[PDB]
Design an enzyme around this catalytic site. Sequence first.
Site, short mmCIF file in Angstrom:
data_model
loop_
_atom_site.label_atom_id
_atom_site.label_comp_id
_atom_site.label_asym_id
_atom_site.label_seq_id
_atom_site.Cartn_x
_atom_site.Cartn_y
_atom_site.Cartn_z
CB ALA C 61 7.62 33.10 63.35
CB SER C 62 4.81 33.15 59.49
OG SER C 62 5.78 34.18 59.57
CB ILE C 63 2.23 28.61 62.05
CG1 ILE C 63 3.45 28.05 61.31
CG2 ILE C 63 1.08 27.64 62.00
CD1 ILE C 63 3.90 26.70 61.81
CE1 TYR C 155 6.03 38.04 56.84
CE2 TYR C 155 4.74 36.87 55.22
CZ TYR C 155 5.23 36.98 56.50
OH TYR C 155 4.91 36.02 57.44
#
Lengths: 375, 378, 378, 374
Positions: C61-63, C155
Amino acid sequence: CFARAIESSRDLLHRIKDEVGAPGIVVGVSVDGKEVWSEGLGYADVENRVPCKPETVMRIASISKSLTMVALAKLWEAGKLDLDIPVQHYVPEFPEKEYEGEKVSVTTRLLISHLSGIRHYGELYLREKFENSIESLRLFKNDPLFFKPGSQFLYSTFGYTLLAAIVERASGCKYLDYMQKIFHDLDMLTTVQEENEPVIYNRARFYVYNKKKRLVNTPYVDNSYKWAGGGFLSTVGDLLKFGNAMLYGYQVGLFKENLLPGYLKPETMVMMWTPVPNTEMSWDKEGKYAMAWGVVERKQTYGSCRKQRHYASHTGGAVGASSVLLVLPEELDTETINNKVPPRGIIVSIICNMQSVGLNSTALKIALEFDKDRS
Amino acid sequence: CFARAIESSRDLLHRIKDEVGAPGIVVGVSVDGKEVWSEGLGYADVENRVPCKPETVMRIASISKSLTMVALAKLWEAGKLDLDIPVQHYVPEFPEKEYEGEKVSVTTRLLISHLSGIRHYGELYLREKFENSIESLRLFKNDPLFFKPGSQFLYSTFGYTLLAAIVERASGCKYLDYMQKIFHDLDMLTTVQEENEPVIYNRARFYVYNKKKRLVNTPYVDNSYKWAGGGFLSTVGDLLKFGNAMLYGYQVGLFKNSNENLLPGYLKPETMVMMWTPVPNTEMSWDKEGKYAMAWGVVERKQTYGSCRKQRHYASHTGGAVGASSVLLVLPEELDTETINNKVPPRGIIVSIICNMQSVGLNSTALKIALEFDKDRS
Amino acid sequence: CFARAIESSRDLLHRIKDEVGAPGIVVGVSVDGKEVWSEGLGYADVENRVPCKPETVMRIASISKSLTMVALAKLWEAGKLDLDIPVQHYVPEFPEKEYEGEKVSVTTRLLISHLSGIRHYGELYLREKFENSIESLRLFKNDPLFFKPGSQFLYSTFGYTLLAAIVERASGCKYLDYMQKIFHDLDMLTTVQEENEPVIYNRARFYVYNKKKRLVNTPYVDNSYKWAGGGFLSTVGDLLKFGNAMLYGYQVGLFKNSNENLLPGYLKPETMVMMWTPVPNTEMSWDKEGKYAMAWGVVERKQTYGSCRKQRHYASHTGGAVGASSVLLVLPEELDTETINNKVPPRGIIVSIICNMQSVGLNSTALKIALEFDKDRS
Amino acid sequence: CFARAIESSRDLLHRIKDEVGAPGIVVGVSVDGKEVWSEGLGYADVENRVPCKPETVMRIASISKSLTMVALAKLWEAGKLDLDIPVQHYVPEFPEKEYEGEKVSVTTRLLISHLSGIRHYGELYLREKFENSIESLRLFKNDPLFFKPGSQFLYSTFGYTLLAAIVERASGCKYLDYMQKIFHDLDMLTTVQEENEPVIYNRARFYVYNKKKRLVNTPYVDNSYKWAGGGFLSTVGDLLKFGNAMLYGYQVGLFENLLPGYLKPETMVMMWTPVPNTEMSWDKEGKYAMAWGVVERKQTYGSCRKQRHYASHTGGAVGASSVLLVLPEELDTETINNKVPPRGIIVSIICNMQSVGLNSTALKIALEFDKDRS
């Protein structure tokens, strides 16, 4: 041999374990009186990384009802106990209940099948200690009957506490001592009441999921108020022995003096495995509830359709644990009656340390697999 | 290195384990800030046959008092807490007390050293859950004081529950969160309050003997009413870190001139000195030659007569909880000029022992082990 | 062989898998640039009984945010992108914005570290297909800023689809093609955008728990509107290669002058340094000790007090997608004179974990695994 | 035994699979009420290399129509449903209709054989979830009838959504639970509605070929607006049980002390009579009867092909194709006096490839297994 049904059964166990997210599960399968499989997956103690194994003991909730029914049957055979008399002859402490202005009678036969008017309190998180069953009776004795006895089925757990009190009154000895003697006779050398102080080896831990979808420990509970209908600890191997003994007694009369006498007379087992009307089996819609067991009969209504298989099961659910014990007798041909020896059937016991898991279907499928292979 | 003191200390552990019949015991020995030994004998779980190991967590009954002392000292240094003001300034709930007809004052420094008049209720097998120390105060708030405050020493546990309430009032946050922050700062990664619902890995089991001389499980208890004393679980390696931090804070002041690039201690040198000065009119239960400082038992150094035993200075604390016993001991070394100039603090030995058996005295064994490791220093 | 470490890690993986009840988990651990461990426990497809294995591809997801930051760094190095110019130079589609009384400027660098005013829409179960990032911009272009840019950390994921639009505008090519070029350069041969039509081999299935505490399939979603964050699939072996490349680029400059036959890093040493510097007024959710560097969570080295916790420096990033959780963590080792003189970069440990279960925190487990592998070394 | 027909049938399966390029195919053949063969070739999941096997569940498209017709027949036998009254008696939601300016009426039996005026919408790639058939009716309720009812045949699928709504109204319970009871009675323990959220074991994947002649995944679809036609997932072994039950109900009337059929023999013969002015798509020789394409027995000229009597049904869903075929055997006096029903052959084939016709292959396999018999 059975080297094919084992992999299928292991796959089924992994399916149910992944579906419910149980930390651990234990299975025991015996075919024709011989234990052919015993497996353990997962962890019995997640904190201490203790694997599950055949020797792991776990809570059995409603199988205690069948164990108590064995004592009731022994008392009935000994002549000390009459099913049709009202229980106030045995237990004067229980008040003479009156329902809707008419005096009703509560009897052992009526209360074994959960047909009495005793209401269902459900799970109660009591941490108190009860010494004798008469003291335990105070939890529900004053309350009135919810239904008219004999008219409606209502699953209740305190009815079997009353049954334990009846066992104490009739047998002349303590209920726990009587059941310990029965366990010793049946060779169930590990079945024992669930209490905290004594050291019980291979004792597992029981978990649940919280509102954050995380595995946590269940609250501390004491099952003294219900040593019957709950409060018993056992391995899968002991449930296998119990089921094998029950099956042998059922089939011994049919088989024809090489054969040893069955624990209970054939008539007693026949009476114990006949379903009663106006009574339902929660974990199988096709079956009814008989004498602390759930019984599905054989019946094919239409040609080329579903043919039901006769079997007797019982599922139990305790705080943080679930279990099932299932007995599947095989069809008795003339040849096997002539040359083979009882028991002829399959006993499957599955126990997991996870709350609210339905293990009846898995046990039925595993029994059917092992029946396919037979030989 | 230490291949001789290890065998002697293991023999001492076996001696105490066989004397009290403990199912298992765990020891941790740290010398000069470096952990040199960590051993476990026996079984942590007798039923499931789980061996004892350095990672086993057990109940620490009285170490928790020193852990709370860390928070109280931090609050004092931050200026949010006054040791001389009466406790009613922080907690208005605690009623005013009158003793034979004269009103008396209960103060923080007085109630730390158990010098207040709160009576010792002893161990009570409570199973109730408590959310905050304010509701836990109802167990002993209404009772009158047993003695004149400041006149007599009487070891008590609920006084530290009052101290936890004071910590909540002063710090502006929850006591448990403050202690979690302190444990995080001290690197004690496995110190956690003793509660049943969460999954705490490597949790031990705690046993006792019945009237038939057989090993049984202790009754289930809930220690929420006394988180401050007897409410925590930890490993030996965490108590070693706690002792090392305390020793560094105590010794950094002398060693300062030599390097002058030495990290400050967790507390000021004056605060640690005050913490480890015994108070008069007070007794140390587990060592007759010492007194009770602030949440610590201190034995001073002295030689009254020539050619006679010289008391060795050390600071310890032992605790006994339901089915468990524990001890944590700090033995500083004598500081010559050469070690002040050329060595770096901490200079001393920290020994921690935990066993899952009730009513076991592990102070003497810890002192003997510390003396062994001290003799074989470097 | 790092056997003890491998066993400890397997235990830790089993712990987290049992705690959350994840059907399957895959781990990859690389030490000093060589892949030392890769394991899969459980089932990738529960219905078809497909076990997890190192080749299993799962949602990261956030990689993807770090992967996009790589492209932004390359554009910065080539001179095609300015981090200080407002984004309206590149994307006129994004309107100018005024926060309260005054007009405000949104820049590339300010928007990389989530410091802009774009509010957090959260996960939206959108099933519509978007062809280009410009039409993906329609979801939030009209909405105003939640905060004044540069004044508060928040975020956000749509900031990174704005970044993808910026990448397309600056590089002059499609974002997917540029990222494919980068993946090919870094030898990540399996990483690819998450879409339904093509046949992607070893594609896993992502599960969740319903209100009845039973395992069920997650609803079908289309992640075209956020390719830059939440739009990619990869194995653990590809994340290991990505982390190794980043670490080598970070340490090549330090190792210079010794056996300087060293190949250059993918990104200049100054670029990597500015990439892994924490920015102030910014927080890192999965570790309170660390702050948020551009597209990364960085924890610096610091010891405030003697004999107290010393912080270890590492850079990680965790992601949570619909029915999946992932983490990628890099732990460099401290560079002594001997290792710079004799050894060759990279010198560190990279741990990647992916599980097909929603809302799992794998940062602490990955840090512990890295610590075990650093203990064993050799 | 049948060791010769199995090889020929495997060859035919390989032929059709290679001709259409399907990733996988599954077959089940039952002879005289006993399953004699069940095979799977290829891969159910190309990405994860999951082989096809008899336990693989795949989409059945138009066999759901026959399954719904079974429920309709049960309601007809119970007297709760009358075919000839207008459907507005059961479903007030459906509006009254004019065609060519005159009132027209639609009946259940007219709607069963697709003889009504409802237009054929075809495949729609919907992804919305419908709770019940009543809200599902909003897709086609307002649209006027394409033809005059009873005047021309037009294969339509939304008419069976209307039939499912009628089942809900008449039986007094939900359509899904009624079909679940029917499946449980018939021993079809693997047949289930096609939905995404629950875990359905051995669920297959369905593929198609794109414009570049490459194998790709089909788009995600939701078949809740089509529970009655489409929206069902079953194995070949379940279709074999369904066909055996239908054959036994059809033949027990002709045949001592036998268990009754699931439906009365009159109901079964009414089910398997072709309706005039109606066409069978997958076999031009036969007609379409009560959700079953029936080919009768007839030899027009001497020494010429004699038509063999059988009843089939093919279905094509997004990325999947299926067929269920029943071939009864000719009953002479000897087999009537010396045998027990069901006598015949049931062949079911399912593959995960779009727009594939499997009726000819099923008929050929049935004919092979009928040759061997013994």
